[PDB]
Structures are given as C-alpha cells and as structure tokens.
Design a binder for this molecule. Structure first.
Ligand SMILES: CCCCCCCC/N=C1\SC[C@@H]2[C@@H](O)[C@H](O)[C@@H](O)[C@H](O)N12
Length: 443
C-alpha cells in the first residue's frame, strides 16, 4: 500500500482547443491553432479543432464524469480569443459566460478548478503583430490575465500562467511543428524570453487582484540519461536538462539568469540586453507544475545540430513510440527540489497514448495505460517519502482529444470519445484511477 498525504489533490487535465470545438462561436476571435490546423499539411489527416470533443456544448456532462469518478481537481485552460477576440481591448461577455458556468459547476460539485491561462491558442490578431516574438506581448498577456483574475479570481484560487513555454517557443517557432509553424532560431529564443516576461507580469498583476490565491507555471520535462560514461555524453545530458527541462525558465525565476549551458549555446539568439529583464522575471511564484511523459538516452553527436542525438533503447513504449521510464518522474521531482526548492510542486500532466479498442462489451480494456499510470504514481509517492513537496497529480487527459499535429489519431484519455456520436466511454484506466482517488493512493 502506498498512501498519499492527507489533502493530496488528485486531478485530471484538458486544454481549450483540444476539447471544445466551436472555435468561432459566440463572437470568439480566431486562434493561431484554428489558422494552423486549417492550413493543409500541418496536422495529420487534415484534422482541426473545429469540433473536437464538442465540450463547448457538452461541458456539463464532462464535469459530471469528473464528479462520478470522484476526482477532486480539474485543470483546464481558457481560450484567450474567446475572451478578447482581438487579443486586447473589447471583452467578449459570452466567452466569460462559458467559463463561468464551468467554474460555478465545478464548485457546486466540490471539484477544485486549476485554470491554465495560456495553453497555446494565441489570438490570431496578436500573431499578426508578431505574437511571442514581439516584446509587447508581455503587456498583452498581463491585460488578458487581468481580465481573467477580475472575472474569476473570486472563485478560482489556483492559476497557471503558461503551459510548457519551451514547447510554445521551440516547437512552435524553431521546429515549426506547432502553431504558428515558424522555423527561425532567433525568433524562437526571443519567444522564450518574452514568455518569461509575460509570465512574470501576469504574476505581478495577480498579486494586485487575487490576494488569497496561488499562481504557478508549468514545464515539460524528460528524463535524460547518458548513453555511456564518456564525459561528452554526461555533458550532453546536462545540456538537455538545462535546455529542455525546467531549468531554462526556473534559473531565470529563482537565480536571475539563464542556465550556464543555455547562455553558452544561445547567447547569439537572445536579445542583447536580455539580462535587464531578469529583475522583473524573478517575481515570486507559489508553485511549480511539472509535466512528465518519457525518458531519453542521449549521446554527444558531432553531426547533430545542438550536437546531441537520442539513442533508442529496448524499453516498453507507448503508441507514440515514447520510452516508458517511470523512475523519470521520481528523478524530475527530486531534482527540482535539489536545484530550486520551490515551495510546492504539482505533476500537472502525466499520461499515455495507446491503441485503444472498444470491445464488444462497450468497454475499453486499457491495462497498458493502467500499468503506465500505476508505475508513475508509485514513483511520485516515492518522491514524497523523500521530502518533495508534491501537492497533487493530474492525469493527462480526462478525454481523448485533438493531439495537436497528431490530430485525433492519438488518444490520451481515461475516457474514450467516439467522435461520430460524441459518446463518452469511461476506460478501465478511468475506473482504476477513480479507485486510486477513493483510496488516496495505491492498494
Ligand atoms: C522526441 C521525443 C519527445 C517526446 C515528446 C513528449 C511530449 C509529451 N507531452 C504531451 S503528450 C500529450 C500532451 C498534450 O496533449 C498537452 O496539451 C501538452 O501540454 C503536452 O505537451 N503533451
């Protein structure tokens, strides 16, 4: 038996564009994911978020599932252009109505909201002005955040500025695989810097508006391991951790500068007086959210850009081909404590995609996903025994949904969605997790 601390928060997580559909309903402005997915060639099968899980219309049923499962917290994101269709200026009341009904319903049913302010659906209007590449986005973002804090901060007390700024910057602006689909290393690093500035400015506004609330920020992370004991493989791991994991953002927030290895590598691409902003970037945060999915074997590689390559291992993998390495969640939790000692930590995403089949019984027998979640939850419990201030754990995701450039082909839910009928089918992992929450841990 592995029992969690009293008061531990068990949650599930979604994002607005991945589940809502109706992107243009009720006066919403377009997002960069609406325009990106409507561009041929960017998303598998030509999938878009036009309908998704139709959560825009089915939100009450989906909250009733969270309730039936006994899940205690729901991490969801708000669509910036539903709220401010032009990015700044005029507030769309019907956008506020939509999330208000959600928030009120969650509270009525005793489910704690965790609101992600930005989960990648930038208003298109702002992308016309440069989006994350433009310094002024710190103002735009602070303004938008103010509107949310004023309208929802009476009821919502747990907030996240940004989901995975590394991904927004690097995948969206260097690899070009996500919206807005750019491949320019100088833009990518200006995005990294502006995300940090926007985040800190939103926290500053949060201190003025929501006095009894907590605010944090969420990072993607992988568990990097060296391919050999050669010094250059060991340095490669250190590089990959500093660049791809929390230190890229937490070294600024807690220590006032980018990690040594990141400066070494990327000083050319950062704005020349970037350090002038570090004072403000260090605005105090209440918690760190860590997302974690996979582990990678790394080697120094002279032919690779960045000089690092991944080495495939004989390990179990998900349907994404991502190696399943549960002790990675223990390592990332121990390490964030050793390096930055944040006051509270949450696992804000953990989950897996598997080739789910609805059987003749009308059920989804996803033992593979249970085994995945079980192993990671056990490792998180171990981190807690060793003194990591892990306050909650959120499964990605409540629902199968639009998996970005993968479209609907990759299913992460603990609830299956038949897109033809929009029927929800709770998966065996869904029932299993319900029991984890009831037991407050593993039996
Ligand atoms: C080259 C190998 C890199 C491994 C990539 C692991 C990606 C794991 N991240 C996932 S797996 C699926 C989820 C997204 O649905 C969610 O919106 C994002 O916050 C999040 O990025 N996410």
């Amino acid at each position: 038996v592995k029992k969690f601390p009293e008061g531990f928060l068990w949650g599930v997580a979604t994002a607005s564009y991945q589940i809502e559909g109706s992107p243009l309903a009720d006066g919403a402005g377009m997002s960069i994911w609406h325009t990106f997915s409507h561009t041929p060639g960017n998303v598998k099968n030509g999938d878009t978020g036009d309908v998704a899980c139709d959560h825009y219309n089915r939100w009450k049923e989906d909250i009733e599932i969270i309730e039936k499962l006994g899940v205690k917290a729901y991490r969801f994101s708000i669509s910036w252009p539903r709220i401010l269709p032009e990015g700044t200026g005029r507030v769309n009341q019907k956008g506020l109505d939509f999330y208000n009904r959600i928030i009120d319903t969650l509270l009525e049913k005793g489910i704690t909201p965790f609101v992600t302010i930005y989960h990648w659906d930038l208003p298109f209007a702002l992308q016309l002005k440069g989006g994350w590449a433009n310094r002024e986005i710190a103002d735009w973002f602070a303004e938008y955040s103010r509107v949310l804090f004023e309208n929802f901060g009476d009821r919502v007390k747990n907030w996240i500025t940004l989901n995975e700024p590394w991904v927004v910057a690097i995948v969206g602006h260097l690899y070009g695989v996500h919206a807005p689909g750019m491949r320019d290393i100088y833009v990518a690093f200006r995005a990294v810097h502006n995300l940090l500035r926007a985040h800190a400015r939103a926290v500053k506004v949060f201190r003025e508006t929501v006095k009894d609330g907590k605010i944090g920020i969420v990072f993607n992370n992988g568990y990097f391991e060296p391919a050999s004991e050669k010094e250059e493989d060991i340095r490669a791991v250190r590089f990959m951790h500093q660049f791809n994991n929390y230190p890229l953002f937490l070294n600024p927030i807690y220590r006032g500068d980018y990690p040594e290895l990141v400066l070494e590598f990327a000083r050319e691409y950062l704005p020349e007086n970037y350090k002038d902003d570090m004072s403000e970037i260090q605005e105090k945060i209440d918690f760190v959210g860590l997302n974690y999915y996979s582990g990678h074997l790394v080697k120094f590689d002279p032919d690779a850009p960045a000089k690092v390559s991944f080495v495939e291992r004989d390990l179990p993998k998900t349907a994404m081909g991502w190696e399943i390495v549960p002790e990675g969640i223990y390592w990332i939790l121990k390490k964030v404590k050793e390096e930055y000692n944040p006051p509270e930590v949450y696992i804000t995403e953990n989950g897996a995609a598997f080739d789910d089949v609805v059987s003749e019984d009308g059920r989804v027998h996803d033992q593979n996903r249970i085994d995945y979640l079980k192993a990671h939850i056990g490792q998180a419990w171990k981190a807690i025994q060793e003194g990591v201030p892990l306050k909650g754990y959120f499964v990605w995701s409540l629902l199968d949904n639009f998996e970005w450039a993968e479209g609907y082909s990759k299913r992460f839910g603990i609830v299956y969605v038949d897109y033809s009928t929009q029927k929800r089918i709770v998966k065996d992992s869904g029932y299993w997790y319900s029991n984890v929450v009831k037991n407050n841990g593993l039996e």
